[PDB]
Amino acid sequence: LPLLGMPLMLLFVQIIAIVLVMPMQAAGLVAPSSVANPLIFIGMLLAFTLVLLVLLRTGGRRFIAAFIGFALFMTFLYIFGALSLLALGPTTAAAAGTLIGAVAVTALLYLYPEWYVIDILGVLISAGVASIFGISLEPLPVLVLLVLLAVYDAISVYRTKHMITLAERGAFVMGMGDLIMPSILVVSSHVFAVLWTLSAPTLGAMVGSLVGLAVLLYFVNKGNPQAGLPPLNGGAILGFLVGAA
Amino acid sequence: RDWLPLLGMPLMLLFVQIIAIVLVMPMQAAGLVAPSSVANPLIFIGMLLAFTLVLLVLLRTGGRRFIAAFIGFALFMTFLYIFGALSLLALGPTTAAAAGTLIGAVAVTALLYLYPEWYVIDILGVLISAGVASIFGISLEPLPVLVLLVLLAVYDAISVYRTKHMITLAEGVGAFVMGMGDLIMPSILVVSSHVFLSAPTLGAMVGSLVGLAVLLYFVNKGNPQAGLPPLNGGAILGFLVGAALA
Amino acid sequence: RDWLPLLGMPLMLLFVQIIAIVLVMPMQAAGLVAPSSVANPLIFIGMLLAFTLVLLVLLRTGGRRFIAAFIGFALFMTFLYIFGALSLLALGPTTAAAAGTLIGAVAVTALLYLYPEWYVIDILGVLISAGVASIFGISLEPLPVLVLLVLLAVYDAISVYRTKHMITLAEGVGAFVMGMGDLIMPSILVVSSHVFLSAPTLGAMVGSLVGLAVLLYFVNKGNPQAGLPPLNGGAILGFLVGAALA
Amino acid sequence: LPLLGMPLMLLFVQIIAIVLVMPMQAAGLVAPSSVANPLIFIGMLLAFTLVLLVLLRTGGRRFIAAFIGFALFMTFLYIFGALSLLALGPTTAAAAGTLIGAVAVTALLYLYPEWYVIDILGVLISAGVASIFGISLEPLPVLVLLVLLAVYDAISVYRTKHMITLAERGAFVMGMGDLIMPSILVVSSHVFAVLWTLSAPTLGAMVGSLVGLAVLLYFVNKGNPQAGLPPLNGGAILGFLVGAA
């Protein structure tokens, strides 16, 4: 049954990312087109992580536990807050309305969950990040970013596999990350000029990603071999280009 | 009866609040502070996280008395601001006032480092705590402070419930900083209310004492509880009671 | 005779210099650089120290392939600048040129990470090295570069003499980075001279080759020596010889 | 014989600090009077050190060895360079003249010395730092700074002594530091209005410091007890106030 579950997880993240697209540009503002944007993005990720880890190596018993709780709280503030209070909206008790909401959620997220809860929250966050970057510019810096990241993945995969043929948390993090990646082409192609059953080529990307994840879960059950991202990234790319022509 | 024992902490509460008010006065005679935005609590919290990160990287990189040095200096400075504020409202801009506070803070900090009388420690803890309380209380207004309080309280209860459950799991299924610090927390709401003999914000002070009562009650019972929600929740209770008055 | 063996390194020298010139050209068609101040070598050195500190804190915080990732990315980017500069002078501002270089750099970096042919490694090392050489050589003028060179050489000889003496004491009384890097150093002086078929700065190139000759001579002898002072001192020798010409 | 040696070391550092005072304000510029200046100074030292150590804990085999070699080279650049080339002066081959000089010295300093050499170089550096801060403002922020630092020292000394009564490089660094401290009152009181045998009260401070060091070396040979700085700092202070009245 979860065999549909994780594709469900994708579909939902994409959907909520689109639903968030409208209220998100009521401010938004992260990063023109510019293909240098993916590079700035990558470097931002590497330095962010490098810092976060040096925070672990300098922490992180109650520190980075809390630190993460806080970052989580902020991003959840933006999710509930900016995206729902402006969608009401806007101001006053609604803003307050969402604070209570986000404090509730992070409190809920912290302590111990129950199966569906973590998945749900992850879906929310994921849709958030997806929406943000997808909005933060167009389907071509995004195309290059995707193919870059994916190619990195496949290479590190083959490499660390070939590095074998001799002789917990980060999983959920990385999971969310792949959940996020194609959604960026879906939002960022919704920010593009057709509009059948609400934006035809973004649909194309979306289905292409759903089949991508299908193929991935298949090879995943075939045994070991799966170059992580290049299925969903590149396949969502194929679906997008298929839905644009 | 059970008076003299363990009343010293509600004593310390009242005292810190009082000295926080009395410090509300002189601290504006040279500004300080740091916009009644609800983002202010967030900036507060994050900056606090930076404060701890600094303190920890400082400790792990110690520093046998380098750590003692770094904190001794931090102390010296915060006492400079305390005393400074005192004389600068007192004798005002005069050289003998300022020099008075420098000599004062040198005296006090030196005393604390020279193995004092350690009833003294509680007293100084009260001074410092009242100081911080005054600063942030003078800084921006209730509703942000209210948010800050409720937030922090929630964090606390999460933390306690977590490590306690981690006790109930692991079978088969420096403290003064935290002390005087939580002594500070609701008092900051006590200040940021008289800043917006006293008002109807006595209410917050008594409610905070009653929170502390519930706290030292449960603490003097077997099988402990969370901390903040009695003190904050009770100070908030009293404060909101001090609204239904006027 | 002893031709084909260990000529590949002077080969690599000449090649890197050549490709550094050929890169001198296109890199100004979009600027880059970074004032013929003698403080520039100092800024260079300090920034280099920051570069290493970053690389090390990155390694010790590794990062099994995170480190591989971080450097893979750095590589990818520097290759983007290389290729970029190429097509952007070639086909110019066109989309097919830029996309050409992105695809190019993806191809190259992917190749290098996929366990290539590792004669390939030397070739790419030559590309990169020529790149850096070109950048700083295009950046500011000789006398600062001269200072930089002599400085670095002095540091080197101190370091070698130190650890060698530490060998002679302790009884009873990734290398490619450093390699191609020192391959780079005098070449930067070769660029920053044609930037101020070639000039009388051929002289610096040959003198650098003769330095390398002395180097691979002593290295192929028992009981090693310092490194930089032959390459830099010899490139400088040839360069100053290329002044007594014109 | 070194019984005079280390006082000699002091006298020399003070002298060269004064000799450097003139060419030093040909630019200079570190830190108005302002008694907040000592505090800024202290905090600067604590954060500087904290960083330097985190540089060790993140280094420091060839790194901080070199890093120090560099910092040393720069400060020696300023010493030879700014103080001698302007004292010639100024510009052209003189500036070059001192570069060769400083590269020589740090090169000389690195590798292995010979007794007198390290002392000499230390004296130079010390005079440099002394001159700089002494110039960088007046004898009253300096007075407070001195008495503060000294009182800290005596307290940490008593404390870590009382922490006993139960049951290499940094030495030279700290040595230089105490060599430095009173010289700051001598320079910074030379930047003050009398002028007998060239500034009478700064002489007063200088001798008061020489007797301070005398008393210190005496108690040092008495056995263990010496509250480090409060002899030379506070005693140079007494000498200054004696020479000013």
UniProtKB/TrEMBL annotation, chains A, D:
Keyword Ribosomal protein set for record: no
Residues passing through the membrane, by range: 1-22, 39-56, 63-87, 93-112, 124-151, 195-220, 232-245
Location, primary (coarse class): membrane
Membrane topology: Multi-pass membrane protein
Domain of life: Archaea
The protein's name: Signal peptide peptidase
GO cellular component, one term: membrane
Gene Ontology molecular function, alphabetical: aspartic endopeptidase activity, intramembrane cleaving; identical protein binding
Localisation per UniProt entry: Endomembrane system
Swiss-Prot/TrEMBL keywords: Membrane, Transmembrane, Transmembrane helix
UniProt cross-references to InterPro entries, sorted A to Z: Preselin/SPP, SPP
